[PDB]
Amino acid sequence: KGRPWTLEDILTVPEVNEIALSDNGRLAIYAAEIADLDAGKPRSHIRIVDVETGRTKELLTVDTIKSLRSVPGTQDWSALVDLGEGQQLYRIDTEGKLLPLIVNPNPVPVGKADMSFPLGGGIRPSHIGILDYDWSPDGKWLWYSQLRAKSDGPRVRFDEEVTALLGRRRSTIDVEVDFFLRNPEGDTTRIMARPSTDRVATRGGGRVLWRGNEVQFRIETSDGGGAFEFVAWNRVNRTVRTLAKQRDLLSMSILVGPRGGQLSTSGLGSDRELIETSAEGRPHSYGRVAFDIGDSRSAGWKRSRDGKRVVIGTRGLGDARYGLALIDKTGVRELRADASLTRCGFDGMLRSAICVEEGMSRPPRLVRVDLGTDKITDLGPISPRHEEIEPLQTIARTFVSRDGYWSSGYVLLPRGHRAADRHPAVVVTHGTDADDRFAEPANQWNYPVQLLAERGYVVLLLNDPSPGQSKDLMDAMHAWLRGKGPPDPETVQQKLWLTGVHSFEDAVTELAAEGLIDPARVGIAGYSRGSQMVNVTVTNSKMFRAASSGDGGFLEPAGYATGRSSYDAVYGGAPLSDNIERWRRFAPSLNADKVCAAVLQQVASASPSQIELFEALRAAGVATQISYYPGATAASDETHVFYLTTNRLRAMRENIAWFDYWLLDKRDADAPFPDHVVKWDRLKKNLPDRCAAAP
C-alpha cells in the first residue's frame, strides 16, 4: 500500500548532477547527493553501474564531486572530488576505486566564510585545490587551473575598489588564477596567471579548445565596453596569443549543430522554430518543434566526433517534461518517454546513452537508452526509500488569467482525498521550476509540499507566466537584463510582476469554482523569484491569508546601490531621484499599508533589503516574523538553498506551524520554536482595523 511522507523523506531526496559513461558504454558511474543527518550536510555517494547487467555497486561517499568525465585513451574516469581536505582532481579506475591525480598542497578558502574568497557567488564554504580541468582528445595532455591565495600586505584601496566593498558581511581574501598544462612526460608548466576580476577564470567548467599545436581557452578582462577574449598557448614554441572577437566563437560555443552553426529556438506561441545559424549568418531551419532548448535543467548538449549527430536536452511547451532530441542533416526527431530525462551521459560515438528517469509523482530511476532504436530499458532505482512511499496524487494543469497569459504548474491533492472536498490551499511558486521532476529543491525549497498534502492541504505549484508565450512579456525581460527601456518601467512592473498576481488569483478562483479550495484559507510561499511574487501579491492582493518569503530583498530600495542596472528597468532610476513616486506605488516596503496577511521571512543573508521589509511591515501593524538561519559556525554563513540539515528541517517545520496557525488556527507544541505561538497571538490581537474582514 505504501507509507506517507515523513519530513525526512523530503530532506533525503537525492540529486544526481554528475553522470558519466564509458567510451564503450559497458560501464558507467554517477554520484547521488544525499542529505546526511549525522554529518549535518549533504554527502555524495559514488556508485558504479554495469549498463549491460544492470547491477550497481557503491564505492565511497565524498563531500563534493564535480566535473565527472571519462579519461580518453583509457577506461578510467576523472573527477574533482573533496574528501574533506579540499577539492582535488582524482582518477577512478575501471574497477571502481579512486586514486589521486593532481593535488594542490595549498587549497584556498571559498564561499561565504571568514577570510575566504567569494568564488561562486555564495556557494558552500570549502577549500579548492583544483578549480577546473580538461583532457586532450588523445588523453596525453592535461590542462588544469588552481586557485592561489595572494600573499601580500593589506593595501590602501581606492575609488572603484571601495564601492565593491559596500555590501561586505565578512572578511575576504584576494587570489589569482594559475593555468597549468601537463605534457605526456608528466612535466607541468604554468601557462599564465589571471586576476580575480576575471569571472570566467574563477568560475570553472569552461570550454577549452585543443587544436593543432595550440590549446585555447577564454578569459575576461576589465575592459570588455564589450568583446570576446581568448588566449591560445602554443605547445611547441611555448608562447601565448590574444584573440578579440565581436561575435563569439562557435568552436568554443555550446549548442552547435551538424551544419556547424549555432542552434536556437526562435519565435513564440504554440511552438518554436529550430534553426541552425551559420557563422556567416544564413539560417537553416529544421522545422517546427514543440520544445525549448539549452536549459541547464535538461540533459545538456553533446556532438559526435564526426560532427554529423548532436543530442540536445528539450523541455516541451506545456507538459514541462524534459527529454532528448536527435539532429542530423535530415532533420530533428524527438524520442518519447513516459517520464522526464534530466541528467544524461553518452558514449563516444553518440549511440548508447544512460539517463536519470525522473517524474513529479515518481522517484528518480536509472535508465539505459538506445538512441538508434529509441528503446529505453529500466535499470535499478536510485533511492529505494522514496520508492516505498505511496505516490501522492499530482495533476498537471495550465491556467489562463484575466490578462490572457497562461501559467503552467501542478496541483497536489491531499492524502485520502475524495471528490467534491474543500481544502485549504498553499501556493508555492519559484520561476519556471514547476515541471516534471521529482521534489526538486530549486522549486519547493524549504516548503514541505509533500507533507502539507499529507496533512490535508491542497498545494498549488504554479510557475510564473512563461515569457515565451508573448512578446509583451519577453520585451519586458529584455529590458530587465539591459537595464534600460523600452518598454517603460510602469509596464515592466505589470508584465514581470503584477500579472503574476492575477494569474495566482485567477488560478485559485477557478479551483474554488471546482469546489477543491476554500478561498477563506489560502496562502502563498516562494523564495528568490518567488519572494518577489509573494511580496508583490500580498501588497497588491487581498486573497491570501498568510505568506512566507524565503531569502528575498529584491525590489526594495535598500539594495539599489548594488543592483542599479537591475532596478533601473523596473523603477526608472534611483529612489531619491525624480522617480521616487515609481518606488512608492510598487516597492513592497513602502506599500506595507496595503498588506493584510501573515508575512514570514526565512532569511540566510540578513540583507538590508530583507530587514527593511520587516521593519516596514512591523511598523504598519502587519503580523510578521523574520527568521535568520545561521551557518555551521559564526565564521560561516548559510547558502541561498540551505545546505544544513538542521536549518532545512526547522524551516520546513516553521512553515508548517506558520500556515497551520494563520490559515487553520492550529497550534502544535512540538513546533521548532515553542514560545512563538504566544507571540503570534499578540500579533493577531494587535492587527489594525484596516485588516478587518469584509462585512
Ligand X SMILES: OC[C@H]1O[C@@H](O)[C@H](O)[C@@H](O)[C@@H]1O
Tell me: does residue 296 bind a second copy (CB under 8 A). no
**If contact means CB under 5 to 8 A according to the sort of partner, which of ligand X, a second copy, none does residue 378 touch?**
ligand X
581 to 600: interface string for a second copy, x by CB under 8 A: --xx-----x----------
The β-bridge partners of 512 are none
Minimal distance in Å, beta carbon 339 to ligand X?
6
Tell me: does residue 345 bind ligand X (CB under 6 A). yes
* CB of 55 or CB of 288, closer to ligand X: 55
Angstrom distances, CA of residue 243 to CA of 133, 201, 293: 21, 16, 29
* CB of 314 or CB of 610, closer to a second copy: 610
Site for ligand X in 277-336 (CB under 6 A): 302
* CB of 367 or CB of 412, closer to ligand X: 367
Site for a second copy in 360-399 (CB under 8 A): none
**If contact means CB under 5 to 8 A according to the sort of partner, which of ligand X, a second copy, none does residue 584 touch?**
a second copy
* CB of 1 or CB of 155, closer to a second copy: 155
The secondary structure of residue 466, as a DSSP letter, is P
Site for a second copy in 103-162 (CB under 8 A): 114-115, 153-159, 161-162
**If contact means CB under 5 to 8 A according to the sort of partner, which of ligand X, a second copy, none does residue 561 touch?**
a second copy
Which of these ranges, 45-53, 164-172, 361-369, 460-468, lies near a second copy under the rule CB under 8 A?
164-172
Member of 8, 85, 174, 378 binding ligand X (CB under 6 A): 378
In whole angstroms, what is the distance from residue 415 CA to residue 454 CA? Answer: 5
What is the DSSP annotation of 179-205?
Answer: EEEE-TTS-EEEEEEE-TT-HHHHH--
Tell me: does residue 618 bind a second copy (CB under 8 A). yes
Tell me: does residue 346 bind ligand X (CB under 6 A). yes
Packing angle, helices 645-662 and 676-685, rounded to 10: 40
The answer to whether the beta carbons of residues 447 and 655 sit under 8 Å apart is: yes
Tell me: does residue 337 bind ligand X (CB under 6 A). yes
* CB of 381 or CB of 630, closer to a second copy: 630
Cα-only R_g, the chain: 26
Tell me: does residue 168 bind a second copy (CB under 8 A). yes
**If contact means CB under 5 to 8 A according to the sort of partner, which of a second copy, ligand X, none does residue 20 touch?**
ligand X
Cβ-based burial of 42 (10 A; exposed 0-12, middle 13-18, buried ≥19) = buried
C-alpha cell belonging to residue 641: 538553498
Minimal distance in Å, beta carbon 323 to a second copy?
41
Which of these ranges, 55-63, 387-395, 446-454, 613-621, lies near a second copy under the rule CB under 8 A?
613-621
- CA dihedral defined by 677, 680, 685, 691, rounded to 10 degrees? -140
* CB of 70 or CB of 605, closer to ligand X: 70
Site for a second copy in 522-581 (CB under 8 A): 557-558, 561, 575-576, 580
The answer to whether the beta carbons of residues 602 and 550 sit under 8 Å apart is: yes
What is the DSSP annotation of 603-663?
Answer: ESS--HHHHHHHHHHHHTT-EEEEEE---SSTTB---SS---HHHHHHHHHHHHHHHHHHT
The answer to whether the beta carbons of residues 34 and 12 sit under 8 Å apart is: yes
| CA atoms 251, 264, 477, 435: torsion sign | negative
Angstrom distances, CA of residue 102 to CA of 80, 82, 319: 10, 13, 44
**If contact means CB under 5 to 8 A according to the sort of partner, which of ligand X, a second copy, none does residue 114 touch?**
a second copy
Amino acid at 407: S
In whole angstroms, what is the distance from residue 655 CA to residue 250 CA? Answer: 47
Member of 3, 55, 170, 333 binding a second copy (CB under 8 A): 170
Which residues of the shown chain bind a second copy in the complex (CB under 8 A)?
Answer: 114-115, 153-159, 161-163, 165-166, 168-173, 557-558, 561, 575-576, 580, 583-584, 590, 603, 606, 608, 610-612, 614-615, 618, 624-635, 647, 650, 672-673
Interacting residue ranges for ligand X, rule: CB under 6 A? 20-21, 69-70, 302, 337-339, 345-346, 357, 367, 376, 378
